[PDB]
């Protein structure tokens with residue numbers, strides 16, 4: 401009788417997050433088969449060495465040992481052990497006699513990660529009094545449990561916060577309760593205009609980024625107003641007013657920039673693009689003609705498409721997403737995100753604004769802080785970052801999925817890329833120097 405080994409593969413081996421040498425048992429039938437265990441990847445950095453048979457003293461079973469590093473991340477991480485017959489060199493067969501015998505190793509996440517944060521330049525950082533914990537909800541009902549990871553917080557807007565989150569009047573509006581004139585805007589010819597925004601996620605994202613940009617360049621823009629030969633109709637557009645502390649019923653009074661998009665741009669049910677709204681506001685490009693009934697193009701002698709402070713990049717792996725986020729965050733740029741996937745049974749594509757990110761001790765990006773013009777509260781919401789494939793030896797694609805803490809469910813929604821808006825310092829400085837050279 402040939403000895404065999406058996407293992408019930410439905411049982412994962414789940415070591416704790418701490419570093420250590422962990423063990424599981426393999427049943428040895430009719431003797432002690434001469435075999436050697438192997439990880440499916442030998443290069444996984446968080447496993448030190450090969451598995452070994454650490455005890456055979458029990459005639460009925462062997463103990464297998466393997467050694468892990470500490471899992472500092474907030475995600476489980478997987479490895480796989482198979483077994484080779486030391487004589488035939490073949491992999492030993494599992495229970496069905498056709499698949500190789502495989503043991504699933506799942507090292508558990510760190511329950512006490514140390515977290516640090518990076519925020520878009522110039523918006524400050526949340527105080528503890530500005531951070532709001534979130535109730536774990538299930539099927540739509542709060543369980544009165546809360547998400548306990550400390551990076552899971554809403555960043556509440558107050559009189560003192562410096563991010564921007566313009567919200568859709570069409571989402572906030574309650575018919576028969578809100579004022580009948582909720583949607584009215586006083587236009588440029590101080591005419592009365594009623595704008596809707598149910599499909600303007602791209603314009604809300606553009607407006608948030610433009611508020612940040614006008615604030616960061618406020619001194620340059622004051623000089624521009626005084627030195628440039630501004631077109632008469634455009635003069636009132638060289639400011640930004642974002643009024644914090646308003647009620648939902650007063651959202652129409654909150655942002656002059658958002659109101660410009662809502663009054664004069666488009667609300668096509670097909671949507672728009674962040675970068676198109678940004679171009680439309682800042683300089684002339686032929687493609688952005690007919691985006692709306694006016695063309696602000698407010699700084700056309702500062703910027704052109706060749707000197708554009710607007711960039712669009714894509715990401716399909718953890719490495720690419722993280723490279724892009726870090727480059728953007730270390731460079732004084734505002735961040736628009738295009739989300740892509742499925743929400744329910746319908747295709748989903750959405751533009752939101754990102755104001756910062758949380759990192760674990762390995763500098764993995766674990767959560768983003770999002771201005772979400774579709775969500776009701778005047779806060780930034782946390783969106784957790786998750787990966788479906790290995791993050792240590794990455795596949796060709798490993799998309800950056802989003803966890804919706806507000807819906808308290810995972811969704812098949814991921815980040816396709818970023819549209820970023822740079823301060824444009826070199827361009828502004830060159831414009832200013834050219835004026836002083838003419839004086």
Ligand SMILES: *[C@@H](C(=O)O)[C@H](O)C(=O)N[C@@H](CC(C)C)C(=O)NCCCCNC(N)=[NH2+]
Nearest residue numbers: 598599600601602670671672738749750751
């Ligand atoms: C977002 C929203 O208001 O919820 C809105 O639907 C939207 O603009 N979504 C974007 C998502 C990213 C900006 C990619 C979108 O899908 N834009 C596609 C615009 C295509 C318009 N096509 C034509 N022919 N006009």
